[PDB]
């Protein structure tokens, strides 16, 4: 998902980010593993990826 | 013999975002920024420098059917469906003060260069002539039998006149509060009107034919036509060349002078899906000519230069 | 062509004969027809106004 | 004393609307007819009213193409008039704070 | 007339009895007169314009990659001039309608 | 017409004149001068609307049925001349 | 291989690919703040 993600670097919130308002401090702030995380989201869209159907 | 040979005007640049047809346009004195009335019941500022915006201005009520800019006083002059002339203070960020005493909504204004005044053309036929910076109004024109398209005015002897719908181009003479005189050369109702920086004739127009009339004395100049359409706006530029838009979208350039235009100008300047008979509402030459605003109900606003060429044929 | 002066006439009408019909030569180069008075009465204009 | 704001700028908006409408109308035949352009405001005016708000095209057969193409034109303006209107009610019902009833729910049918 | 003045109303009081004179600052008509202003603005163009720059669980699936480099299909920046749909339209109805 | 159908009639041309000076159309103003010259004044309605019709525009219809009702009248010498005229301010086949 | 079930297309690059030098901008974005009105600081 890094090689089908088209950045060397910059990554926004992409699939699954900003979770702030009950655990607003002692949510997680980010990390390589989180992008990992959104590349995991990605493999769940492509682990799914129906051709034409209403998807996330 | 069409002498002076007319240079070939193309196009610029092209803009669009606006939320509704562009019913007026104006520029700064300095060429610093630009602005356009709207559709959209907002007045739109747009900073054409670079290409780029101005400001978004809210408050009309309806529809923005005229601007002007205040060569004293950064103060807006605004007009339009809401029948609520008000003249925009832009140095709090917020308006002047509004001008009363329309009774329908107002088709136009125009600002005196030289006394402080309120011109307008109201749909209720009025055409207000107001005393502005006092609160104060000057006095009513009336006499015109349909509302009045068009309002034009200025520092020299008494060349008042305001575009009526009736046909008949009407000219007042302010100074007695008074008129001056009946135009009865336009056979139909007369939707475009310009001041040529020759200053001598004053310049109009009408979907039948173009009447350019030389004054002050009740003298005229000459009959324009060749273009056949509703007339959207006419414009007389510093080189001698008038543009003259059109709401089917036919645009004629305009060589004077030499008696008869300068260009035919057909061009399809529609937006996506949305065009239907849309054309250009309005148009504007700027300071040193090298480019025209283009303000058309598709929300385009496109501005026109040249590419420098020779041409220059006949006919 | 006197008789379209009936009723009020005071100064300005410059509609009785059809001679303005067509308008006069062409477009020509003059100063003081194609231009503008000089500055003085624009200035005496603005203070009457 | 009028632009009263409320519902009365939307009245004021149609009329003025169907103002410079007439006399477009009326400059766009160069002879035709005289009391033949003043039925014209109906048949436009209402099919414009029942094509705009329906999903009828309102084609009228044997139509003066370009009033048609005009009347048109300025109906999808008056289309327009009644759509972003109502995306900035949508913006004044959920985020901004609710009026009353009848233009809460009004403007909700019409979305 | 002579006539038509008795009483007043709101929104007529004395207001901006003083009005403002275009500053040096600002606009200067001489200035205006002899500016520069095409040159100014050819060059002020010519520089905007000048410069623009900027494995048994995935084989298990009975499915395979679908919806893969289509991004661009949906335009960022679009001015359309149909108010039904296009693209703001489109979030706005899918937002208040599900 | 109204005016016209009273038995005075004076004020009725004189309306008519009013509407010569008033604007022409070049429809009411020929028809309305031939109803009048057809009423009386022959040599003088004619001349009024020679006068008039040769003041603004010329004519096609009206200009040659005028030239034919003051042909017809008495003489066609002043009609010939005033058929030259014409024909010389628009010149065509017909 | 034909278009998208929600987007699809409705009436699309008629205005992009129109002009052929002419360069389309549109912001709906901001276009400047309101803090300064093109006004003097004279403060």
Redesign the interface.
Known sequence: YLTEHPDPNNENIVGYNNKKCWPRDARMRLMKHDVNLGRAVFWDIKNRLPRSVTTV | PKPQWHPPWKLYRVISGHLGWVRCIAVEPGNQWFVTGSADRTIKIWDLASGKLKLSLTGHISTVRGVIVSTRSPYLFSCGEDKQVKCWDLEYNKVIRHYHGHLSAVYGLDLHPTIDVLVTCSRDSTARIWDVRTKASVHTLSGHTNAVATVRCQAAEPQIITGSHDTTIRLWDLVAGKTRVTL?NHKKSVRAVVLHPRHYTFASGSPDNIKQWKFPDGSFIQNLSGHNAIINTLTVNSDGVLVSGADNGTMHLWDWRTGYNFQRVHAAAVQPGSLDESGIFACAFDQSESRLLTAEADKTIKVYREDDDTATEET | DA??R?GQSKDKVIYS??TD?VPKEVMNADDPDLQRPDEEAIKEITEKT | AKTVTKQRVESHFDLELRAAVMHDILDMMPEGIKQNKARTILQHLSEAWRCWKANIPWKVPGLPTPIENMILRYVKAKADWWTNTAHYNRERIRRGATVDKTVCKKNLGRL | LSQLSKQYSSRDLPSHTKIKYRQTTQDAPEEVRNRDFRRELEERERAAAREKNRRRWDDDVVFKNCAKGVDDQKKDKRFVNDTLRSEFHKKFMEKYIK | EMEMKNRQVNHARNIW??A??T?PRVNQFWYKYTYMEEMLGNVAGARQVFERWM???PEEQAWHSYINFELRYKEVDRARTIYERFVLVHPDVK | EVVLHEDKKYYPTAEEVYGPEVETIVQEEDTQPLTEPIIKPVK
Request: no cysteine; charged share 25%; net charge neutral.
């Open positions: 009865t | 008789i379209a009936q004969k059809y019909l | 004149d009013r010569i000076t604007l003041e603004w525009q």
